[PDB]
Amino acid sequence: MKPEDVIKEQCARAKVVAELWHGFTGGAPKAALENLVVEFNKAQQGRCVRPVPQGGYRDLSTKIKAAFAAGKVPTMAQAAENNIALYLEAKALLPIESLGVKLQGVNLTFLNAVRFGGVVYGVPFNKSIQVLYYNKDLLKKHGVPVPATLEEFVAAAKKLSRAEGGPVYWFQPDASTFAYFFFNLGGSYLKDGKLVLNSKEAVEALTLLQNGVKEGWAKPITSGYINQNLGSGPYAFSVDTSAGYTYYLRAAKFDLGVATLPGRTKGQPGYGLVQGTNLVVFRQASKEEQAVAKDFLEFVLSPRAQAVFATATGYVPVTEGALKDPVYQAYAAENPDYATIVRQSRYAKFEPALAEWEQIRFDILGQAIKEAILNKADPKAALDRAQKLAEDLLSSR
Ligand SMILES: Nc1nc2c(ncn2[C@@H]2O[C@H](COP(=O)(O)O[C@H]3[C@@H](O)[C@H](n4ccc(=O)[nH]c4=O)O[C@@H]3CO)[C@H]3CC(O)(O)C[C@H]32)c(=O)[nH]1
Ligand SMILES: [Cl-]
Ligand SMILES: [Cl-]
């Protein structure tokens, strides 16, 4: 009896049903969301949440845009900060504090990101941070400390790749992995208000990755997630979302390590990219649906819900109270990777919260990165093309 079957039964008997459109395809993220919902729906008297999978996040934004064109929107959806800026163009979003949802205690790294013109429009829900995954066994085998600096990280990848006859730093050639190198080389996407994709720190970041392919220390992954490719050739390291934790744990045939990111110096860890989503509440929803959403949002921000969701997934607990919950404490005392995830969440950067950013990051910036890595395009030429295509897209709206 699958949690989604139990939810279908709950919603059938309910007097009111708030749909929640999401981008979890399966694994621990989809399961944790549904177990949370089952427990919520049990607690209510004929008022229920119905999670509806819409594919991935890009499929979810496409289906939400189509739902507006049809005039049939869900009560709630997942939304990254760029999707919030898009939905605010249509004044489609209910301010969260208008429902009476208390947000005291929500980590300000997460709450500042959902605040637009001083108004909170989203509840942080599944917020990830990039971490350093590694092969504890392969580092021990060659006497290599877990690198704390970018310099150390490059040296380790060179040493281990030479020892093992193959590139040990695995990466997707995408905007998320670029962001780690960009940010920690001192890059910023906004210069005096303007989006800039071809800055010298962008060129430096893409050049480092392309040189790591050429020098035989970096392995581009082109088919599936890094965790779906383990087993083929030697693996030492990747830089990847904390929501990958359970997928890495299931796939790895070696002893898996999680570390804080290599930074410019030992003074501080490297910044990680914040990914994952907020829950938003649509204005088009019925007052009765919005009251369900208010209850469900106060449930999701409860310390026990935050403790169960974060320990099941490797998402970052979004509240201070979650770290004080005994279920979280018992997990963390048995598994030091939860503390390492939280520690990394202190050193956290976001991508621009622009309405156009989904298209930009995938179809323009993502594409320039694949052109340089997979087709050996000059990094500067590839990013100059991305700059002009982004400038054309921004000016057209
Ligand atoms: N639409 C839109 N997408 C965005 C934006 N910024 C980033 N992203 C995408 O969000 C994923 C990170 O979100 P996160 O919740 O941290 O992680 C996801 C999955 O990544 C990850 N996962 C799933 C299966 C698996 O084998 N391994 C695994 O790691 O687990 C989670 C549940 O699906 C990136 C990765 C991507 O999905 O492949 C493309 C990128 C944005 O601004 N807009
Ligand atoms: Cl493996
Ligand atoms: Cl990308």
CATH code (residue 20): 3.40.190.10
In a shared domain, residues 192 and 68? no
Instruction: Indicate whether residue 244 lines ligand 1 (CB < 6 A).
Output: yes
Q: Which residues pair with residue 194 across a beta bridge?
A: 191
Q: Which two tokens stand for residue 152?
A: 């150390």
Q: What is the DSSP letter of 129?
A: E
Which structural domain range is residue 76 located in? 3-125+277-345
Helix, strand or coil, per DSSP, at residue 218: strand
* Spatial CB neighbours of 218, under 8 Å, sequence gap ≥ 6: 157, 167, 169, 170, 171, 209, 212
Query: In angstroms, what is the resolution?
Result: 1.8
In a shared domain, residues 339 and 357? no
In a shared domain, residues 283 and 358? no
Please name the amino acid found at residue 206: L
Of 324, 345, 366, the residue that ends a domain is: 345
Residue to probe by mutation, ligand 1, list 33, 229, 273, 275, most atoms within 8 Å of CB: 275
In a shared domain, residues 193 and 324? no
In a shared domain, residues 94 and 148? no
Please give the Cα distance from 87 to 216 (Å, whole number): 44
In a shared domain, residues 178 and 248? yes
In a shared domain, residues 313 and 237? no
Strand ranges for the chain from DSSP E: 16-22, 47-53, 76-79, 115-116, 119-120, 123-135, 169-171, 190-191, 194-195, 218-220, 237-241, 256-259, 272-281, 348-349
Rg of the chain on CA atoms, in Å: 21
Domain count for the chain: 2
In a shared domain, residues 244 and 358? yes
Proximal ligand: closest to the CA of 133: 1
In a shared domain, residues 155 and 230? yes
Element (H, E) at 396: none
Q: Cα(9) to centroid of ligand 3, in Å?
A: 39
In a shared domain, residues 88 and 11? yes
In a shared domain, residues 315 and 385? no
Q: What approach was used to elucidate this structure?
A: X-ray
